[PDB]
Design a protein around this motif. Structure first.
Motif, mmCIF file in Angstrom:
data_model
loop_
_atom_site.group_PDB
_atom_site.id
_atom_site.type_symbol
_atom_site.label_atom_id
_atom_site.label_comp_id
_atom_site.label_asym_id
_atom_site.label_seq_id
_atom_site.Cartn_x
_atom_site.Cartn_y
_atom_site.Cartn_z
ATOM 1 N N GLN A 175 -78.369 17.290 -69.320
ATOM 2 C CA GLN A 175 -78.648 16.035 -68.600
ATOM 3 C C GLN A 175 -78.258 14.837 -69.480
ATOM 4 O O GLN A 175 -78.654 14.755 -70.689
ATOM 5 C CB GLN A 175 -80.140 15.940 -68.202
ATOM 6 C CG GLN A 175 -80.449 14.778 -67.244
ATOM 7 C CD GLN A 175 -81.910 14.775 -66.706
ATOM 8 O OE1 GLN A 175 -82.708 15.659 -67.006
ATOM 9 N NE2 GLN A 175 -82.274 13.706 -66.024
ATOM 10 N N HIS A 229 -72.400 20.429 -57.288
ATOM 11 C CA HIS A 229 -71.896 19.142 -56.826
ATOM 12 C C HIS A 229 -70.434 19.338 -56.532
ATOM 13 O O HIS A 229 -69.693 19.885 -57.359
ATOM 14 C CB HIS A 229 -72.189 18.043 -57.843
ATOM 15 C CG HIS A 229 -73.659 17.827 -58.038
ATOM 16 N ND1 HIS A 229 -74.271 16.612 -57.805
ATOM 17 C CD2 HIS A 229 -74.656 18.719 -58.253
ATOM 18 C CE1 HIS A 229 -75.579 16.755 -57.940
ATOM 19 N NE2 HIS A 229 -75.837 18.023 -58.209
ATOM 20 N N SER A 254 -73.332 14.148 -68.033
ATOM 21 C CA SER A 254 -72.541 13.988 -66.801
ATOM 22 C C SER A 254 -71.495 12.889 -66.870
ATOM 23 O O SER A 254 -71.741 11.816 -67.440
ATOM 24 C CB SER A 254 -73.441 13.811 -65.568
ATOM 25 O OG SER A 254 -74.240 15.005 -65.395
HETATM 26 C C1 L1R Z 1 -76.905 10.586 -62.966
HETATM 27 C C2 L1R Z 1 -78.303 10.211 -62.502
HETATM 28 C C3 L1R Z 1 -78.300 8.779 -61.999
HETATM 29 O O1 L1R Z 1 -78.681 10.991 -61.338
HETATM 30 C C4 L1R Z 1 -78.335 12.318 -61.267
HETATM 31 C C5 L1R Z 1 -78.272 12.666 -59.923
HETATM 32 C C6 L1R Z 1 -77.924 13.948 -59.548
HETATM 33 C C7 L1R Z 1 -77.670 14.907 -60.508
HETATM 34 C C8 L1R Z 1 -77.742 14.587 -61.858
HETATM 35 N N1 L1R Z 1 -77.476 15.582 -62.828
HETATM 36 C C9 L1R Z 1 -78.162 15.779 -63.966
HETATM 37 O O2 L1R Z 1 -79.150 15.147 -64.264
HETATM 38 C C10 L1R Z 1 -77.676 16.866 -64.870
HETATM 39 C C11 L1R Z 1 -78.657 17.596 -65.529
HETATM 40 C C12 L1R Z 1 -78.302 18.625 -66.381
HETATM 41 CL CL1 L1R Z 1 -79.540 19.529 -67.200
HETATM 42 C C13 L1R Z 1 -76.941 18.923 -66.580
HETATM 43 O O3 L1R Z 1 -76.508 19.936 -67.388
HETATM 44 C C14 L1R Z 1 -75.965 21.098 -66.733
HETATM 45 C C15 L1R Z 1 -75.105 21.862 -67.721
HETATM 46 N N2 L1R Z 1 -75.919 22.554 -68.756
HETATM 47 C C16 L1R Z 1 -75.962 18.198 -65.909
HETATM 48 CL CL2 L1R Z 1 -74.289 18.589 -66.134
HETATM 49 C C17 L1R Z 1 -76.328 17.169 -65.049
HETATM 50 C C18 L1R Z 1 -78.086 13.291 -62.231
#
Ligand code: L1R
Length: 247
Positions: free
Chosen positions: A195, A94, A198
């Motif tokens: 997840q 991103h 963020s």
């Molecule tokens: C925030 C939600 C409404 O929608 C999203 C849309 C796009 C990307 C994301 N990101 C994640 O879900 C996410 C998942 C993981 Cl496993 C994660 O960890 C990575 C570091 N180990 C991160 Cl930082 C984000 C959500």
């Protein structure tokens, strides 16, 4: 957060818990954020880009539990939701993953600092800690990649900054990770953001000051070998933050 420890808001008092209301009235957790001044919380654009309507959001400060109340917590709506016009998402990476939420109580006030609600300092231009520096992250994100629910209690952990050179190795992220991002991980791959973390802070102690060095952004899996957590490098967005935190 994979690994790490349960914590409470008094130890992370700049942490902001961000939720979204749905038709039908149910409220779900969205992302973390950090209070950078009384009216402003900073988070990640990707948290909001699919639902960019400020009215949908609820921000809590002084809160330690996901779905219950904390003594001294304060509830806010979002007066202005500012997303980075150049945000984008590739397969893993991103870009310009940063956002600002101007907060305000129902009475029209910004945050009142207390024991459990405090601002975190922003870094200064191109002055980030050296690689190998230990920093902390906080969030309500998954404790295991196979979880489908978030922990009820806030967590924190400590990770080490990884150099851009290492992060760009072929078995890491190659050229997908840029100079506008920071990698951080555990040397034994046992603790990491995940997840739901963020938007939350990566806090480093810089010249005796707790500094908002990064914002949780992306990564491949959670606590996977050679796959660090990736963070928006806040120091590179100072002009953008400064300009949007005005009028
Ligand atoms: C925030 C939600 C409404 O929608 C999203 C849309 C796009 C990307 C994301 N990101 C994640 O879900 C996410 C998942 C993981 Cl496993 C994660 O960890 C990575 C570091 N180990 C991160 Cl930082 C984000 C959500």
């Amino acid at each position: 957060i994979i690994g790490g420890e349960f914590t409470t808001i008094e130890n992370q008092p700049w942490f902001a818990a961000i939720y979204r209301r749905h038709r039908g009235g149910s409220v779900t957790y969205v992302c973390g954020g950090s209070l950078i001044s009384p009216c402003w919380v900073i988070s990640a654009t990707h948290c909001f880009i699919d639902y960019p309507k400020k009215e949908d959001y609820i921000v809590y400060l002084g809160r330690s539990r996901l779905n219950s109340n904390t003594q001294g917590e304060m509830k806010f709506e979002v007066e202005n939701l500012i997303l980075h016009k150049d945000y984008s998402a590739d397969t893993l990476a991103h870009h310009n993953d940063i956002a600002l939420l101007k907060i305000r109580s129902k009475e029209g006030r910004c945050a009142q600092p207390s024991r459990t609600i405090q601002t975190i300092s922003l870094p200064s231009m191109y002055n980030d800690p050296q690689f190998g520096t230990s920093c902390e992250i906080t969030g309500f994100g998954k404790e295991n990649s196979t979880d489908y629910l978030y922990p009820e209690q806030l967590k924190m952990t400590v990770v080490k900054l990884i150099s851009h050179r290492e992060c760009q190795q072929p078995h890491y992220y190659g050229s997908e990770v840029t100079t506008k991002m920071l990698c951080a991980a555990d040397p034994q791959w046992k603790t990491d953001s995940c997840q739901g973390d963020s938007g939350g802070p990566l806090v480093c102690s810089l010249q005796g000051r707790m500094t908002l060095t990064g914002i949780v952004s992306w990564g491949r899996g959670c606590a996977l070998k050679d796959k660090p957590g990736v963070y928006t490098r806040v120091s590179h967005f100072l002009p953008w933050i400064r300009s949007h935190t005005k009028e």
